[PDB]
Amino acid sequence: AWKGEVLANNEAGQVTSIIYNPGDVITIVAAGWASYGPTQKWGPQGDREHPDQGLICHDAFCGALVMKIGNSGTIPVNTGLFRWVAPNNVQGAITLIYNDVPGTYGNNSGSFSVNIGKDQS
Ligand SMILES: *C(=O)c1ccc(O[C@@H]2O[C@H](CO)[C@H](O)[C@H](O)[C@H]2O)cc1
Ligand SMILES: [Ca+2]
């Protein structure tokens, strides 16, 4: 399993040790407070009131936790995933990323502590 932090200001994303393979079932639990600029802090679900103006993931609110599996598109993680299975032809290292607009990560603060584990299958 993997346990670590994902800094909101980390545009490249946090690479984990989790290699998602075909047929894998995974569980992710994320917690913490982070910001995409404002003094206020939000959770892994981001800011439900903030409009999407170029986010790396259009399927989640700004300030939410997302991930990539291999060289796939951004996938919503939010508070986490319970016994989750990836789409077909999706595989590779899991990279956790703070959902924000490309090139704006500079003024982000906080982070998310995240737990990733593979489930029995
Ligand atoms: C509108 O209510 C509003 C717009 C922007 C904002 O902060 C910026 O949000 C950007 C993402 O949309 C980007 O992350 C900037 O760096 C932030 O300063 C708050 C509220
Ligand atoms: Ca920002």
Residue numbers in the entry: 1 to 121
Authors' text:
Because hydrophobic groups in the sugar anomeric position have been shown to enhance the affinity of galactosides to LecA,[3b, 14] acetyl-protected 4-carboxyphenyl β-galactoside (GalA) was attached to the peptide dendrimer. Similarly, the structure of the GalAG0–LecA complex shows the phenyl group in the hydrophobic groove adjacent to the carbohydrate binding site and the “face-to-edge” interaction with the C(ɛ)–H group of His50. Binding of the tripeptide portion of GalAG0 to LecA causes an average 0.66 Å inward movement of the phenyl linker relative to the position of the nitrophenyl moiety of NPG. This movement triggers concomitant inward movements of the interacting Glu49-His50-Pro51 loop of 0.45 Å on LecA. Overall, tighter surface interactions between LecA and GalAG0 are observed relative to NPG. However, an intermolecular T-stack of an aromatic ring with the C(ɛ)–H group of the histidine imidazole side chain at a distance of 2.5 Å is unprecedented. This interaction probably contributes favorably to the binding of the phenyl galactoside to the lectin. The strongest binding was observed with the second-generation glycopeptide dendrimer GalAG2. This dendrimer contains an aromatic aglycone linker that engages in an unprecedented T-stack interaction with His50 at the LecA galactose binding site, as evidenced by X-ray crystallography.
In the case of the opportunistic pathogen Pseudomonas aeruginosa, which causes lethal airway infections in cystic fibrosis and immunocompromised patients, the formation of biofilms plays an important role in antibiotic resistance and disease progression. Biofilm formation is mediated in part by the galactose-specific lectin LecA (PA-IL) and the fucose-specific lectin LecB (PA-IIL), as evidenced by studies with deletion mutants and the partial inhibitory effect of simple fucose and galactose derivatives in vitro and in vivo.[5a, 6] Understanding the glycoconjugate–lectin interaction is a key feature in developing potent biofilm inhibitors. Herein we report the first case of P. aeruginosa biofilm inhibition with a multivalent ligand targeting the galactose-specific lectin LecA, using the related β-phenylgalactosyl peptide dendrimer GalAG2. The structures of the lectin–ligand complexes were investigated to gain insight into the molecular basis of glycopeptide dendrimer–lectin interactions.
